[PDB]
Amino acid sequence: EVQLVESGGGLVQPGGSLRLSCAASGFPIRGSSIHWVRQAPGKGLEWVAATYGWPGSITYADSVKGRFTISADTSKNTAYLQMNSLRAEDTAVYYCARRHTYPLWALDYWGQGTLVTVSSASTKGPSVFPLAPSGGTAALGCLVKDYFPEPVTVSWNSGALTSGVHTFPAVLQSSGLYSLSSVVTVPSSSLGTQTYICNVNHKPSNTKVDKKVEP
């Protein structure tokens, strides 16, 4: 019944500003405790800000105090997290969550999160290169190089190829750009017979690439 949906994520340069939206359904925002919890990639959870329900008692973490500000608007039944003077350290997935009071005192419902990227890099489409096949088993894949920001999605044969697929986590290069690989192992007996296409989608730059992987 209770559901929270995050919005407002995306890319911002250091010192810039962003405002996240936390749309509540199933419970009233006014008089309710909402927490903001962020997660930098590969790192742990970090509580950031919280209301206890009423206009006062708004609390912030030291890492964000002075720069972040909570709001709400009961007509839309959504809370807001205004983020100013952002630094690259604030790059994270940002969760909003309802803190059930008595008798739980716990974040029982979370949103799916929204990604906030603070960087000096600019939106850039990926180049998709083939990793050409050459253990009774052949390996092939696609190199998705120098895009920004996250995320990208990779499928094979329009979703018809799922077995043996490894899409690797993206790596952040010293340039500030991202790059990832997607590989799949197939029977070597099917190389001259079966077509293998990787389908790359980079939503932030409206990039769709389908690349054929041949020997």
């Binding site: 290169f129 083939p130 990793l131 050409a132 390996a139 894949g141 190199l143 192992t185």
Partner: peptide, 25 residues
């Protein structure tokens, strides 16, 4: 691991860079 190596595609070399990929499966 099963180890595989992937030379740069000709597509990427015309772009001016070369990437070699080592896969451990």
């Amino acid at each position: 691991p099963s180890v595989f190596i992937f030379p740069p595609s000709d597509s990427q070399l015309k772009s001016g860079t070369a990437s070699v990929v080592c896969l451990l499966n």
